[PDB]
Design a protein around this ligand. Structure first.
Ligand SMILES: O=C(O)C[C@@H](Cc1ccccc1)[C@H](O)SCc1ccccc1
Ligand code: NI
Length: 183
């Protein structure tokens, strides 16, 4: 069972490397680690378990964040009211197309690997298409918009050694871009 002590912190070099593509099929050990990543998000979102084990709530986790330099991510976004939820373990995910139009969380972003908050809007694509493999090496294409697009782009940044705060404007951190949609 993963906990916060498994999450490496900003400054750890693994967070700034470029994660490696996986060969398919995955090793038993690789499956186990991807299931535990999802299991972490599930645990962090249960108020009892998260309290008992001191978990920060998460909707996304990339393997580099537990110091494994490999291109797999977990996303767990619970139903918010839409009837739409997102429960995805992805191998070698890749953004293949996206909108020109940007979007931003008006609160800015947070990160399990970042102990402090950094203020500033992080502009991303409002709409993306992703090709990935699932845990069994089958093919997945995701068409995502808004909150889920932002989450997946955040997790994929991790695989290219990019950190949310790198996108924050230096002089005008809270300046929305022209026609950017607020989520
Ligand atoms: O540390 C991570 O990579 C997981 C982040 C991802 C994220 C943060 C901000 C914006 C998009 C993605 C955590 O999931 S943030 C914590 C959280 C948990 C439940 C509800 C809202 C926020
Ligand atoms: Ni993060």
């Amino acid at each position: 069972m993963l906990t916060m002590k498994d999450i490496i912190r900003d400054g750890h070099p693994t967070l700034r490397q470029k994660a490696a593509e996986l060969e398919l099929p995955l090793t038993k050990e690789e499956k186990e680690t991807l299931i535990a990543m999802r299991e972490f998000l599930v645990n962090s979102q249960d108020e009892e378990i998260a309290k008992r084990y001191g978990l920060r709530s998460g909707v996304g986790l990339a393997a580099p964040q537990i110091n494994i330099s490999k291109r797999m991510i977990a996303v767990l976004i619970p139903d918010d009211g839409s009837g739409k939820s997102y429960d995805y373990m992805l191998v070698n995910p890749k953004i293949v197309s996206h909108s020109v139009q940007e979007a931003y969380l008006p609160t800015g972003e947070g990160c399990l690997s970042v102990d402090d908050n950094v203020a500033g809007l992080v502009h991303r694509h409002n709409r993306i298409t992703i090709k990935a493999k699932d845990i069994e090496g089958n093919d997945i294409q995701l068409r995502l918009k808004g909150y889920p697009a932002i989450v997946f782009q955040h997790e994929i940044d991790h695989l290219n050694g990019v950190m949310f705060y790198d996108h924050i404007d230096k002089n005008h951190p809270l300046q929305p871009h022209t026609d950017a949609v607020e989520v």
